[model samples]
Target: RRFERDPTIPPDSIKVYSRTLFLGGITRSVREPVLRSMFERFGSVQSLILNHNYRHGFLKMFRRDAAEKAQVAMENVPFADTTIRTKWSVGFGPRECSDFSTGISVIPIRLLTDADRTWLVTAEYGGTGGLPITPGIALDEPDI
Candidate 1:
């Protein structure tokens, strides 16, 4: 059979986790700090795997729920001239599913988002960028 896995990530079976979120549409102008500033509001970033071109990356958060909030907060979020997008990236498993021969999946797939957000083409759903909110801490930035 032909290889159908994502070519960007390392060729390993390190099963993706629910804690990780995928950030895409990153242009060269997007800096690490800006990415951090946007995401750190939700939770602590445990690991960040950014591509060399700065167009995409995987961010692992300290908490699972934090990613969900980040996903909602980050939808069509801007970076430079580009609006970056995020997804749950929950390993090589379904983040959501239903009787959707029907095609329901991953909650609130949305009437606004097109095939990019709604369609489930692969077994692995990519991660959505996130942060772990530390209660009582004041936010230093509101750029998102």
Candidate 2:
């Protein structure tokens, strides 16, 4: 059963001792700093695994709240530039079960601007392969 459907289970009840988030687009080097800035705000990063290809990675948070916080903070922040964006999703398993592998796959090819704020995805990947976030759209740039 999906975690969202279970109303009885409080989000905080389940201690997220560790979490693996599948992020696409940016490479390990690029994502490392972003992950560090995002997750470090909440708690210590237990482990971060970015594949050699730099296409995907797994981030482990110290606690469930930290994971949730990270998710909320990095869902839709502009990376590289407005033309390119970043995609984030929860859960880890086969590519079939997640949307990291099969999607429009916008990668932050460059970092035109930087923000000191956090963002996360509000909805799950519908598998439609459309614009994950508004392209070239500029939100209030965080004062870095």
Residue 120 local lDDT, model 1: 26
Please provide, for model 1 over 1-144, each residue's C-alpha lDDT reduced to its tens digit, 9 standing for 90 to 100.
112233333222211225566788877776677787788899876667778475788776665556667777886786677878786553323444322121112222232124332222221323222232212221111111
Candidate that would win on TM-score: 1
Off by over 4 Å in 1: 1-17, 52-54, 92-144
Give the worst 10-residue stretch by lDDT in candidate 1: 135-144
Per-prediction TM-score to the true structure, in the order listed: 0.51, 0.42
State the displacement of the C-alpha of residue 39, model 2, in Å, after optimal TM-score superposition.
1.7
lDDT of the candidates, in the order given: 0.48, 0.39
- Residue pairs in steric clash, candidate 2? 73-118, 73-119, 74-119, 74-120, 75-119, 75-120, 75-121, 80-110, 80-111, 80-112
Overall local distance difference test of candidate 2: 0.39
lDDT, residue 58, candidate 1: 77
